[model samples]
Target: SKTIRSRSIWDDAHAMLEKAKAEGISTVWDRAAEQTPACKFGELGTCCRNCIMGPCRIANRKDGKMRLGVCGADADVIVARNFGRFIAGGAAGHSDHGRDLIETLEAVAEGKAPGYTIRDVAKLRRIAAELGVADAATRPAHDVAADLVTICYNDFGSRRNALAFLARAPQVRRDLWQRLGMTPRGVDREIAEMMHRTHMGCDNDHTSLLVHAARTALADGWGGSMIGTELSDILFGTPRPRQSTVNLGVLRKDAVNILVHGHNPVVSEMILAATREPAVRQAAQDAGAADINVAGLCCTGNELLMRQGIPMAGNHLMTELAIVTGAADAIVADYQCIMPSLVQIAACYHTRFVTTSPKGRFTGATHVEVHPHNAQERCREIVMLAIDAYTRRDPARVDIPSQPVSIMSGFSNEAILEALGGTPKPLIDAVVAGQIRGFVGIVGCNNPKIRQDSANVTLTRELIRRDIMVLATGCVTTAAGKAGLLVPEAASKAGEGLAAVCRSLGVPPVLHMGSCVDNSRILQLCALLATTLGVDISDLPVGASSPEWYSEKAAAIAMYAVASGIPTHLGLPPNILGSENVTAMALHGLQDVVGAAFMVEPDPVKAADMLEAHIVARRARLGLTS
Candidate 1:
């Protein structure tokens, strides 16, 4: 029999560990708890090691926990430091991806990388102006994009410089960041400060910690991440409204199965290029005595599949399974979300694990350095390797059947506008006319334990039925596309009022935005909706749903939305189930701060109900409810 234990972060864990030992368990105890968050004075947030008279903690948790450090530091000083650090960590993760993408854009702009080139010049011009870069007409498309890419690449860590995209924000928001003294000088610098401040015995104040966290997250949303998203659009073609498919059924048994597993597009974009080669296709056909197939996994999968119509093999947890089936020939990984299980799983079959990127590498897998500049050539090299392996495929060993559907995908934020009214004016007009009640974004991962894409599809259908125009990003958008809900035809199932708007415009009832990272696009849309209407974001009847989320990234994103004041829901387990106090603060307290809250509902029906309720509450607050 198994024993159960309960504990909270606020409680001591010494007893739990002792109990586990008594139970003859030498391994980690599920109930094990910690006295602190592995900190001395920093945990209480009242330490100061900045100048280092002495790294000190507030030895007053029992007394009051509010004094200064060894060097006469005030509570406010310590508080600000804590806040700055969190923001730096969040900013670092987002901005670094931007830097690497700049490298990729450089490769494509110079034509140094085979298989990747400028696909959408119109979008390039649009984004260039938005970023206040030089006009696209000044130089050729590639040159124009290359110049813009260079600017964005330097914007993050540009030494005492303001972020490049800050000017594009609402004037008030720009002032707010500046007034708070939280404007990140550069993306890298913010992260560096966070590390310095959070180090043992450094500036530690609860309020300061929160500030750093805010700064870091803001840098991610408005600084590094924003540049990455727009430049990717400029270089790789902003996702237009298109169609694609999803699920495990897309894997091809006879074809050389290439699974692009990572968070960045560096490797996947190259693999996409390789698959277009006739020789690679022929090699795949010859290998399994079939044809060629390619699919994506995780956010990168969402990115490529949404834009290029590549099907998805799986999400975060399914990377090993793709290899386990003996259906995959090569799994090309770039950065983030690589599975350690793949090293062990690959041993069971003939799968070749290929690693790309400098930061991310696995020891057991073959390393094929995919530098941004050499991406295409390296991609071709890897494809040929997969092709050679395909030729040796055991005919009796493969068993994959077609399981993907035709989906209308690549509905990015810009694409969402095109879907609504072909231009921003009409979309705004239609919303004012009440034909479209509001908008909702259904996005994030899929858990096989639940009906695959069931929450996404059903929640979307319900929202549209209520005259709430739906927009999607990541896997949820793919699910809608697969269900044929992205085409103009989907308008029929929409509420009569919204259907009227769709009929007048001949647009998709639900729009599909691109990838998870592009969720920022939806953020922009919410702001646009509010700004254009001259109202608070909470005043807009817009709601967000991640009906099925199984990742920490999703949680991070949810926090962002809550901070932004967009009522958001997750149709899965609550992370803070042990603490309703935390959940309540997330759900209600943050509403006062950012105008949004986090909701939990595992059942599809209940989830939809909560979404509708929040939408109604927001609408009512804004005097939009009928």
Candidate 2:
């Protein structure tokens, strides 16, 4: 009983777990349980496999004996090396995703991409002009897009002194970054250097390693990720307020249920379009299905939910359970945060596991690799495959877990500004008046080691009730949505100050920003606020949290947030615990180095308290009343 209940906090997830147990179907929880009492060496990040000379590990000792690896490197270097590479991996993931968007934009500008055009020409001109594209307003859409593409591509290469968007940060912050050698230049350059530094006998100083780790993360936050969000807005139309639903019930039993997993909007957007085609709709009818339905899984779901108001089936931990609903006729995946077990689980039923994008190939999956030049045609084929799979749906295996919950999504910085009457004045006034204490972005993943979304939901609720507005992204979108915290009426659940502000704006206390890469929006928002108030970002009463994170990308995000002066909270500590020096640098020393640091706390209540205290301190520094 504890096993099922402790695995997740959702009624739908609980039902799926029961159904999975009855059928003896394995899930993420089962696998996580099998690996309980994880390796202490690996957990502490003291193990080293960087070189073949030896598979070495550092052993704990009181007098510093037996604490060195076979390579003679102590725990400090080993832990920092591991963490540096860890940040590199995350930086690569987001930066690569941003590179894909640049490539897509190039294709569209060249007239090589079918079914893809610059959807927001106005935004295209604005962004291009800001990046110093001459006469962007007078240029043709593709011409302006072409110049923008050139700038974005250069950020990926080793040409720029600093990222193009780094200009958007306050000059004071920019000066700080330059003084510290943290100003991110070329996106690829930082990642490559990190790999080189972490190689055997390279950069050995732990403090030096951690500083570059922060630098590498800044490249993701300011360079690659900013490009992705701005380019996406130019191509996909900037997200505005939209209505959507979440949870496992979004899957339709009568219709052809298609789940789009992974992070890229390029794949999911086209798939959504093809599902609306007359031929595709007719195919579903021919298969005895009422209609075709598309729901989101992970970040890709957040992408669509923000842009198109698509219903979300679930998040990271909910992927396997979503398949257990038995109505998932097909799952079309791109890449990132997709569990490999999905292919095996789909095999247990008639669900077709379709892997799009050459980058995300599951061995047994039906692969119809998609690229910008051919995504429209490929997605149509993919949707038809889902219709075909719908014909093989097993009614006996079908179980719709629960009803979908209503949510308000698409609160991009543009939309937020629009709601605030085209400036940050009123929102700043709210903070100054203490009606709205501060803001925190709860952007994180779902880890099996923690009860799914427990910390995310609890921390968000706790913050809002304390009069702090929340900004939601990544998997936290589903968590907050399922908790009825994403609707305008949900403002009633907040403190009176926050509730009044939300009611005036007709929005929820928690604003659903966008996907993981779009955390750039949060970074950009902080920059805007700091500039408007004539202070550094660290002076703002703002913070961030990733309570259920379990990925390299999350680590990089946390690092970048802290480097940008947003004190970040983690539900669990990273593997740097073996080195007290490295851990201390993260938890305290960085407070002096970067003006912010990481807070590790498993208890949501205490995390909320700590974050609140940090916000109160920031307000005091700004000479504002709490």
Candidate 3:
């Protein structure tokens, strides 16, 4: 196996890695190596730390004595409970982000948010009307928004038999979920129930536990995440196709570089606004910088890149290395996947590591808590801190590697329909004609376990060459853009059929949907296509893969994709492999129940083959040529 040193495919990352090593600084790669040969029991999901009664291990002893927990839980129960909690953690991250957006909208309605307003009022009313908000079309904007907020809060509450957005799905699929007792009543309600069920004595049936995991993940994709995406568009303006750049080179030595890390755009959006303020620009000028630059890291980068055309500095693995550039003035973080080591790394240089949300904090970082009402002021303060850090930046330590790569951004569903001339008919026609055979939402994150972006890029090329359109999100967005595959001209790398479709539509074979949370957009699209054809989502030639995922968010994405009847691929198998029965159920049994299953293939080429096989099968079922 290749060493971590040779794993990354990007030249800029390699340059920064070398710099970090030379400076005697540690990164995620170093930490990962330090923790090598991880615990087998923990990796296999056989170790249970759920209760104080006993931290048990279910092992297949030669004497068969250690095969169950002290609570008498078998391997199946332990694995299923662990996996259920894993999915819940991810769902909670995204759903909580969604809830924050809801509160932002609520504050906007109450005139409590200083700078936040309805950027897409049309979308607000449209969504309001869809949710049965009374007088949506004719009511005052705040009145309609207030009504819509109440309805969405209800989905997060306990009264609903189904999520409001689940109505967007095909009736047949909804009926199946209802029949199977898998319909999500409320987002938080389902998450709370999963926790209760996975408790020591509540629910012990492995199969039944897995069912609620699906329901919980479904709430994320269709309920919480859907609410986040839609309301974000309403509050922050629906993203349309735009141009941007990617890679660490987006940072400028002559500029005050402020990286907006983490997931939520509530703070990042305002951070960008603060950077553009005349006073902030003057502060940068006084600091002897050319300009103030705001670049994105992770899904926060994905969000701003989608809506505001902000250049991305890096993705998940690049977070630490980005600071290694010694040019990043401040890293304004909000939530999930912002590494704690970032504090120590930022301390190694002149960069200011600022934590903006109470949910995301490091021991040695600056804390400037931001809320809806005070964000306008707090963001300005954060930018000033970056400007101050800029004056302290060490020229001797700065090494900006490589030039930024140009990439297209903002491929929202609305932009796609607009590209198709106000309808999905052109896209549907292209699919039926076999010009675009199928779609695979190639979404996910980077894993130090896998060579960074090696599988993601290879699998994307493999799929598009075989004529499958790629819908990319999350860290995969940065991977695709950095590979030059996110631009329209990259169609040259695709097969003749997909290339021709790309040329006609002026879009790349790979479309950047949005952040990880925006995977809900893909769900919305899949449900739309299924409903249009009067079929279940399983009947569509669609697939999902997270080639180099390392986060629980990616796990929830794969699980929800499979549960929604989209066959999902993962480059690394989850920790359920210790139990033969549990592994079998994940790999094969779910196919029987959900019409889709989890596929684990570390080889991107083989993963492409499996995804293609499933797409071809669905095409054949749809009576269309593959």
Candidate 4:
């Protein structure tokens, strides 16, 4: 039982693990334990398998036998290339998602997509005008959308000096980016260039590898993720302050529970819609279910939570356990972060695991592939599958963790600015007055190596207590919500200054921004504050941290954040320790080059101290009170 408690901080998770073990079901924690000590080469970042020449690895022993690959690449080159690849992989994920948004918009404009429409036409006009679609304000919604689609598509092509949205960055920042060779040229080009550059006999300098990697990461935020966020808001509704619930308790025993897993909103939004249909409700009732309940998992959940007030079942680690409750009738997935092991787990129960995207296919899961044109019909069918599965569920195996916890979410840039009366001055004044010392955007992920969300929750509490307002996003939202920090009442736990600021605004000490792609929302917020203050983003009192991060997508986020001049903290270093040069460059070398650097600290309290120091220094630099 103590061992189970060591794996997670939540009673719900602990109870489920006990049930899972009792049923002889192996879990991520069980697998993690089975793999006790990991391989030294992989952990040290010394392994290279890019080419089959020798599938070589480099090592410098007291009596050295291996120092270079068969291709004559040293530890520095090998490790930097590996790190570059890691960053590019994450960049591609967010970037590709952005492209999907662009494609979906084009489909809508062409009248090819029947289900999806521009729900937030106001955002459509604003984004179109901001990106330079001529007379966007006067144009019809579809006409303006067509032009915007052209512009967004152009970003993926090779025709831009920088992204269309780079204008949101301050002039000084843009100038510095240009001078530093960091302005991303094209979204697709930079991602491809990283792939081309990392090939054998390609770019070899550790410095060069990292700079291109920075450009790739920059492309993710400035172009790809920015496009994804705006279009999602334009297609779905722009998120405003909304009430919701979180955790495993959101799962309903008497209802046909369908968990929307993965990152995309195109499918999940439709699934939510289908579940609302009268016929679907009747079908669930016909199957002995009280109702049809739709809850979200991971970023997909974040999207539904932000736009539709959907209850979040859980985050990345809870997908399997949500099924373990014997209540998840169907696991609907789209792409990214949907664990393949879910199929194996769902098979253990009467759960009907369904895949909706060609990109998110699990080998043993039912594939009901959905596109915009057919989503309305397909999702309705998927819901019925859940209803059917609900009839077969064993009441004897059901175990819900606890009651739902209340959470407040949806703090987009528009929402925040609106709260301050369509101006940033009041918020800025609060910062200047030390009513809020600094802002730390806690963008987090869970690692099996770290007791889930322990670091994430601890860092958030420590920062809020010290008057640091936190902007929570990604899986960090799960931890913050579960820890009761997402409610406005959480302000009582903060320092006097922060609590007063929160009380006045009627907001929590930590703001729930959006999902991982919504990390772009933070980029936009910082850019707005920077441009308003007539300073660069680096000159602002802000920092980003991933206290329990363990994903490639996080690397993309952390990389772009630092390259954009935000000091980023990581609880675990990317596997680059095998090369001293590469490690040093990541730690502080980039600080000299980019005005910000990456800080890797495992201890969340000490991590808060370092973040506080950086924020305080930036406040001093901006001539603000501590």
Candidate 1 TM-score to native? 0.79
Candidate 3, residues 314-377: lDDT per residue as tens digits? 8899999999998998999999999999999998999999998888877888999999999999
lDDT of 4 by residue, 1-626 (tens): 89999989988899899999999989888888889888888887889888989688898778877898999999999999999989988988898889988988888998888778999999999999998899999989999999999999999999789989889999988898888888998998998999888899999899999998899999999999999999999999999999999999999889989999888999999998898888888888888888888999999899999999899988777877899998888999988888788999999999998999877778999999998878889988898888888999999999998999999999999999999999999999999999999999999888888999999999999999999999999999999999999999999999999999999999999999999999999999999999999998999999999988888899999999999899999999999999999999999899988889999999999999999999999999998878
Cα lDDT, model 1, residue 245: 67
The CA lDDT at 377 in model 3 is 98
Runs in model 1 deviating more than 4 A are 1-91, 108-111, 158-162, 176-185, 285-288, 420-422, 446-458, 478-493, 500-508, 550-552, 571-585, 599-610
Error of 3 at 358 (Å): 1.8
Quote the positional error of residue 306 for candidate 2 in Å: 0.5
Candidate 1: deviation at residue 505, Å? 4.7
Model 4 TM: 0.99
> lDDT of each structure?
0.65, 0.93, 0.92, 0.91
Candidate 2 wrongly placed segments (more than 4 Å) = 62-65
| Model 2 quality (TM-score) | 0.99
Task: Give the local distance difference test score of model 2.
Answer: 0.93
Candidate closer to the true structure by lDDT (higher is better), 3 or 4? 3
Candidate 4, which segments miss by more than 4 Å at Cα? none
Q: List the residue pairs that clash in candidate 4.
A: none
Give the range where candidate 3 is weakest over 10 consecutive residues by summed lDDT.
1-10
lDDT tens digits by residue: candidate 2, 375-395: 999999999888888888889
Q: How high is the lDDT of residue 620 in model 3?
A: 95
Query: Any runs in candidate 3 off by more than 4 Å, and if so which?
Result: 1-5
TM per prediction: 0.79, 0.99, 0.99, 0.99
